[PDB]
Design a protein around this ligand. Structure first.
Ligand SMILES: CC(=O)O[C@H]1C(=O)[C@@]2(C)[C@H]([C@H](OC(=O)c3ccccc3)[C@]3(O)C[C@H](OC(=O)[C@H](O)[C@@H](NC(=O)c4ccccc4)c4ccccc4)C(C)=C1C3(C)C)[C@]1(OC(C)=O)CO[C@@H]1C[C@@H]2O
Ligand SMILES: Nc1nc2c(ncn2[C@@H]2O[C@H](COP(=O)(O)OP(=O)(O)OP(=O)(O)O)[C@@H](O)[C@H]2O)c(=O)[nH]1
Ligand SMILES: Nc1nc2c(ncn2[C@@H]2O[C@H](COP(=O)(O)OP(=O)(O)O)[C@@H](O)[C@H]2O)c(=O)[nH]1
Ligand SMILES: Nc1ncnc2c1ncn2[C@@H]1O[C@H](COP(=O)(O)OP(=O)(O)O)[C@@H](O)[C@H]1O
Ligand SMILES: [Mg+2]
Ligand SMILES: [Mg+2]
Lengths: 430, 431, 314
């Protein structure tokens, strides 16, 4: 019925996609070889949302592997759960963007886009009722950001009535992993604002903070961060695969969480998260999940929701619970924090309950918050861009691929307008 | 004889209907697979072939999850396969999607199935429609379906069992839009509309039954008890019988005021059952308590217009008369000036049945009340204020506009609701 | 200087509907007062009816704007009406020739006047050039200037019939009922006044909007519906911008221009920097009933108070 096509571009996108597919395959009981060895019928009841049935009791994920360099997907293929993917969906070039948005959007991506779109069309026509797409990438690299934005624009042109989801790793506020991340981030937000239905913003620094403070992990690696992102993705898409007492798909969340077209940048979160030693000292109840969800330190983006006001909030519970408890918890949260929710929207919180819990835990929840405190990320990126752009530093790398300064000015002005809108919608005027 | 067709649309309607049909099969001795192991139950079932009973129901939804749950569950062999109708993509909390875009590909199929069901009928007198205001498919497809049925049938009564939005408790952000739009469209196509509030059911379950975790099953069981009490006059014989026409001719004084409130008594747990000698006067009195009301509104803020009392079990007419006279002489509850005789009483014989695993005791007598009161004007005012707040800045409007709805429909619906508010305020002035 | 004039052109009754058992829901009194049906009171500057011909609306539509469109940023004439009212007829049949081919001869003693014109349409949230066959164009913003359509074609007629040739070729390339759901056609005139001084910036903007459709109640699915509802969302964005440009004393704030390509083109023309006048068309029949009195009519009251500026004689 409602089915999803997955696309991942670049090094970070590829790694997050690999972790996410291992997670989902273990959730639906599919071995590395692709055969089914589960123990419930609900696992195979809605397998078609993410998988294609192959010959001989085999399941092939509906994923596209895109990269401008071959090493990352070579490692992905040679690793575990690397034989589960269809080899024809590995689409790679040979040159690479080199941390250049122009190279990934106008020089190499302009050459790989035809092949990637042919693969995407072949995957999408075989769908029975396409629900939407889903892109995993970042905003600080060349191939990831540039090719992801190009693919998003092309898909929006081809399929304008569908749902486009993005899980983009926005640049970190404190330490920068690339000298030219402001340029790429601005030029990619310029396209995300227009061509994306809803965008989930995640920061690596917030993930480190979660892994060091809540999980008490002494030495967190990128595997843990990809694990957290995979958990968030599965929690977001859980209602399409399992029955529930009150269910909401992607389009319902988009309708309930996006009041105006240009405001679709959310911050995600997960609960419960605890250390190994502290699990004996806590009780898993709906109030505890609700308390942990609405925590500043639990957010997956480096923004503090207490600096602004929530527009809308979505919580997707999983497990066996009572709707009365969930509803009174939402009411209590709304009434206690009346200064942190917008006045001109009553009942800021949307709710959904899924019957089947994550493997292991008996309870879980997912948080999606559309807050006006996300303007700080855009404001910081705009400040860095306009500081580096007056001196025209590192600009010739971008203008040697045909890009002209009018595009930079347009992107900066669009980002400034988005910041102004988010700031202005903190005023009730009533 | 005389039969009734039940229509369940949306997730709320489908689940409520599942509970109601489990209760109905339990009442008449029908096994979950339809067979009778051992004939006044044909007003809801039909004899097919060699001793199989098929309910006269149609299950409609725009997504396959809950209808598939029904198709796989223990009652998979009770319903006709073609009566569980399923779409592909739900309305996603959008009135425009359900009414204009997604409902138009299965409306013809649903109407054809309804016609096929009613043709087999020989004394059809009404439809029962279960839905919720806040949903997308619920509100939209219910409005479209009632418009089509009113065009097609016209004289047959059309009752409603809807889930009114709660004053504070909510599970969606765009609820006021859908509620206002569906009310505006449906106001001229429904003969009656009984409503309950989920928040009030939570309160009743927490207080009366002493349950701290009342999932949707308990609410659906309470609503099933209400519907069973309403239709027992049809299915069983009694001292006084009430049809589907008497409800509309007694509870609806004006064509735009057809929103009664449904309560039930006694809702008690088996711990307090052994210590209480429940009798006609006590349950009749309990039907009037503001805390026992099943919609989150205070009847003391308005004036009663017409009340229907449905007794079943070990109930004597003289005790009913005495209890009603006692209620009438009470000065704390008010009736409108132009309704000197405002009671309709029906007395049945079959006591309410107990569903194993339920949270209710076994009682020898029970009461179901349906009352028309002006205390719902406050609920209308609250809904209109929410609509006005969310609409002044045109929030979420683009979602509806992109699915085929013009901007004028919001203004039309708001003006219609204002007119309804003025009508409710004018009907309650003494003269 | 500030009054955004709103004129209502009451269309003559349709020939097929006139005798088919309908009444008139719009009653005309004179050129200053109008009455609806219930019995609502409406005043919209000048009011026209079936008696006035195509050229008879010139007296209160474009003539006391285009006296000499140099002292101000001047014309931003829109055309509401929705389907079947006659906005496209009124604009593109006659009442655009009074603008040019009828007001190209205006004196030369104090100035030397030359013009530059361009034509574009907005279809499916994309911009196309109607005079030359070119693909979608990109709108670029900047602090110094306004919005500029990257790739538009500029033309400088040096006579009068050149404008009629350009206009005639600008309508056969419009997406003409694949009248029905269509594209918003924008005509831009640039006035040059080289002195025989540097007071030469003026631009005249003429817009012929599309109509809002109800789809399922009156319309279709597939195409004519995907190409539809883009008109609806663009009109919603335009209405939001208009409402935000005339709200009480707050005004200012943040006006959501970027929600559509149509409103971006009007960033420098819908705000208060020019003398602008609106035209709306309404059908007096009762078959439409509701769509004739809504943001078609209620909203134009809110756009009679769009305070503007004209001191910038540039
Ligand atoms: C003693 C014990 O049994 O521990 C559990 C466990 O549940 C705990 C400790 C887990 C554990 O998680 C971690 O320790 C962890 C470390 C780094 C990064 C992220 C997590 C666990 O890994 C998590 C894992 O849970 C799952 O398997 C979930 O289904 C999870 N899937 C995976 O983790 C997974 C990993 C590889 C391959 C396939 C699946 C999941 C979560 C969300 C959505 C879908 C699936 C299990 C049972 C445990 C350990 C092993 C310690 C916790 O995590 C989650 C996601 O539930 C830590 O905070 C919770 C608290 C839990 O009690
Ligand atoms: N009493 C009761 N109410 C329910 C039940 N299920 C859903 N609801 C109500 O329905 C509201 C949510 O909207 P739905 O009725 O589920 O909408 P829908 O029918 O699924 O249609 P969509 O909006 O397209 O998903 C909630 O606010 C609940 O109050 C139920 O089983 N019992
Ligand atoms: N070479 C390369 N580097 C990237 C790309 N995208 C992002 N990066 C950089 O990689 C950093 C983190 O990415 P990564 O560690 O792979 O993401 P994670 O493992 O999921 O947390 C970011 O700060 C980016 O600067 C890309 O496409 N190619
Ligand atoms: N003053 C008028 N006299 C006669 N017919 C008119 C008048 N104004 C408009 N019409 C008719 O109304 C119709 C409206 O169509 P048109 O203006 O081309 O597109 P739209 O319906 O989108 O405005 C035209 O076909 C035209 O014949
Ligand atoms: Mg549903
Ligand atoms: Mg036209």
């Amino acid at each position: 019925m409602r089915e999803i096509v997955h696309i991942q571009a670049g090094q970070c996108g590829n790694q997050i996609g690999a972790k996410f597919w291992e997670v989902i395959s273990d959730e639906h009981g599919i071995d590395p070889t692709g055969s089914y060895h589960g123990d419930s019928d609900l696992q195979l009841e809605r397998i078609n949302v993410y998988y294609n049935e192959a010959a001989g009791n085999k399941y092939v994920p509906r994923a596209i592997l895109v990269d401008l360099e071959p090493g990352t997907m070579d490692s992905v293929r040679s690793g575990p759960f690397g034989q589960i993917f269809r080899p024809d969906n590995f689409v790679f070039g040979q040159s690479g963007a080199g941390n250049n948005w122009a190279k990934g959007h106008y020089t190499e991506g302009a050459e790989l886009v035809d092949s990637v779109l042919d693969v995407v069309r072949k995957e999408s026509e075989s769908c029975d009722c396409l629900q939407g797409f889903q892109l995993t990438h970042s905003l600080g690299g060349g191939t990831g950001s540039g090719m992801g934005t190009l693919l998003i624009s092309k898909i929006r042109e081809e399929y304008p009535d569908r749902i486009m989801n993005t899980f983009s790793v926005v640049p970190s506020p404190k330490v920068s992993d690339t000298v030219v991340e402001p340029y790429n981030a601005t030029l990619s937000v310029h396209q995300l604002v227009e061509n994306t239905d809803e965008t989930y913003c995640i920061d690596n620094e917030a993930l480190y903070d979660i892994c060091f403070r809540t999980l008490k992990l002494t030495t967190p690696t990128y595997g843990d961060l990809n694990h957290l992102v995979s958990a968030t993705m599965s929690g977001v898409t859980t209602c399409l695969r399992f029955p529930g007492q009150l269910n909401a798909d992607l389009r319902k969340l988009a309708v309930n969480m996006v009041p105006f077209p240009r405001l679709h940048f959310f911050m995600p979160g997960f609960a419960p998260l605890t250390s190994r030693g502290s699990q004996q000292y806590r009780a898993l109840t709906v109030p505890e999940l609700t308390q942990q969800m609405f925590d500043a330190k639990n957010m997956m983006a480096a923004c503090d929701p207490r600096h602004g006001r929530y527009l809308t909030v979505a919580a997707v519970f999983r497990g066996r619970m009572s709707m009365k408890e969930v509803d009174e918890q939402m009411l209590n949260v709304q009434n206690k924090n009346s200064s942190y929710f917008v006045e001109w929207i009553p009942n800021n919180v949307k709710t959904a309950v899924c019957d089947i819990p994550p493997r292991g835990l008996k309870m879980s929840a997912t948080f999606i918050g559309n807050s006006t405190a996300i303007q700080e990320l855009f404001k910081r990126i705009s400040e860095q861009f306009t500081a580096m752009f007056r001196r025209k530093a590192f600009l010739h790398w971008y203008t040697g691929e045909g890009m002209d300064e009018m595009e930079f000015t347009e992107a900066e002005s669009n980002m400034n307008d988005l910041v102004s809108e988010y700031q202005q919608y903190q005023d009730a005027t009533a | 004889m005389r039969e009734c067709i039940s229509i369940h649309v949306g997730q709320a309607g489908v689940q409520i209907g599942n509970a109601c049909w489990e209760l109905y099969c339990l009442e008449h001795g029908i096994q979950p697979d339809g067979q009778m192991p051992s004939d006044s139950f044909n007003t809801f079932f039909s004899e097919t072939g060699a001793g199989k009973h098929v309910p006269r129901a149609v299950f409609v939804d725009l997504e396959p999850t809950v209808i598939d749950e029904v198709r796989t569950g223990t009652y998979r062999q009770l319903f006709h396969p073609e009566q569980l109708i399923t779409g592909k993509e739900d309305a996603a909390n959008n009135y425009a999607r359900g009414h204009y875009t997604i409902g138009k590909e299965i409306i013809d199929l649903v109407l054809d199935r309804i016609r096929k069901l009613a043709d087999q009928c020989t004394g059809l007198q009404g439809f029962l429609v279960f839905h919720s205001f806040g949903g997308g498919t619920g509100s939209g497809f219910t409005s479209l379906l009632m418009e089509r049925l009113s065009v097609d049938y016209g004289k047959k009564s059309k009752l409603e069992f809807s889930i009114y939005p709660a004053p504070q408790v909510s599970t969606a952000v765009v609820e006021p839009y859908n509620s206002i739009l569906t009310t505006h469209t449906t106001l001229e196509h429904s003969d009656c509309a009984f409503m309950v509030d989920n928040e009030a059911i939570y309160d009743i379950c927490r207080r009366n039954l002493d349950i701290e975790r009342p999932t949707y099953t308990n609410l659906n069981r309470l609503i099933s008890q209400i519907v069973s009490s309403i239709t027992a006059s049809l299915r069983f014989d009694g001292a006084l019988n009430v049809d589907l026409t008497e409800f509309q001719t007694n509870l609806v004084p004006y064509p735009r005021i057809h929103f009664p409130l449904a309560t039930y008594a006694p809702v008690i747990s088996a711990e307090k059952a052994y210590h209480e000698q429940l009798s006609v006067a006590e349950i009749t009195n309990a039907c009037f308590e503001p805390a026992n009301q099943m919609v989150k509104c205070d009847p003391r803020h308005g004036k009663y217009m017409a009340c229907c009392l449905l007794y079943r079990g070990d109930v004597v007419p003289k005790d009913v008369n005495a209890a009603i006279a006692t209620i009438k002489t009470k000065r704390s509850i008010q009736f409108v000036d132009w309704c000197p005789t405002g009671f309709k009483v029906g007395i049945n014989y079959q006591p309410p049945t107990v569903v194993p695993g339920g949270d209710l005791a076994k009682v020898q007598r029970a009461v179901c009340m349906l009352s028309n009161t002006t205390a719902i004007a406050e609920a209308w005012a609250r809904l209109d204020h929410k609509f006005d707040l969310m609409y002044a800045k045109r929030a979420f409007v683009h979602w509806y506009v992109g699915e085929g709805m013009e901007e004028g429909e919001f203004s039309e619906a708001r003006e219609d609701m204002a007119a309804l508010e003025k009508d409710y305020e004018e009907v309650g002035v003494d003269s | 200087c500030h009054h955004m004039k709103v004129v209502v052109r009451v269309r003559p009754e349709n020939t097929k509907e006139k005798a088919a058992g309908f009444h008139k829901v719009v009653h005309v009194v004179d050129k200053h007062i109008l009455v609806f049906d219930k019995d609502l009171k409406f005043v919209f500057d000048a009011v026209f009816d079936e008696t006035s011909t195509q050229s008879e609306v010139f007296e209160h539509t474009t003539k006391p704007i285009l006296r000499s469109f140099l002292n101000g940023y001047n014309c931003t004439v829109l055309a509401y009406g929705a389907t079947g009212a006659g906005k496209t007829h009124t604009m593109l049949g006659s009442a655009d020739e009074p603008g040019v081919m009828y007001l190209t001869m205006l004196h030369k003693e104090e100035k030397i006047c030359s013009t530059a014109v361009s034509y574009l349409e907005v279809y499916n949230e994309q911009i196309r050039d109607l005079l030359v066959n070119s693909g979608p164009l990109a709108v670029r913003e900047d602090t110094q200037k306004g919005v500029v359509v990257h790739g538009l074609t500029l033309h400088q007629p040096k006579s009068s019939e050149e404008i009629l040739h350009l206009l005639d070729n600008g309508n056969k390339n419009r997406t003409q009922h694949p009248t029905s759901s269509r594209s918003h056609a924008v005509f831009q005139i640039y006035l040059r006044q080289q002195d025989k001084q540097n007071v030469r910036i003026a631009k005249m903007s003429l817009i012929d909007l599309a109509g809002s459709e109800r789809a399922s109640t009156s319309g279709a699915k597939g195409t004519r519906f995907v190409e539809g509802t883009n008109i609806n969302r663009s009109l919603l964005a335009l209405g939001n911008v208009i409402n935000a440009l005339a709200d009480s004393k707050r005004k200012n704030q943040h006006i959501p221009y970027r929600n559509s390509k149509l409103t971006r083109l009007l960033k420098d023309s819908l705000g208060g920097n020019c003398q602008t006048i609106m035209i709306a068309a309404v059908s007096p029949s009762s078959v439409f009933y509701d769509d004739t009195y809504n943001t078609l009519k209620y909203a134009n009251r809110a756009k009679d108070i769009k305070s503007s500026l004209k001191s910038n004689v540039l």
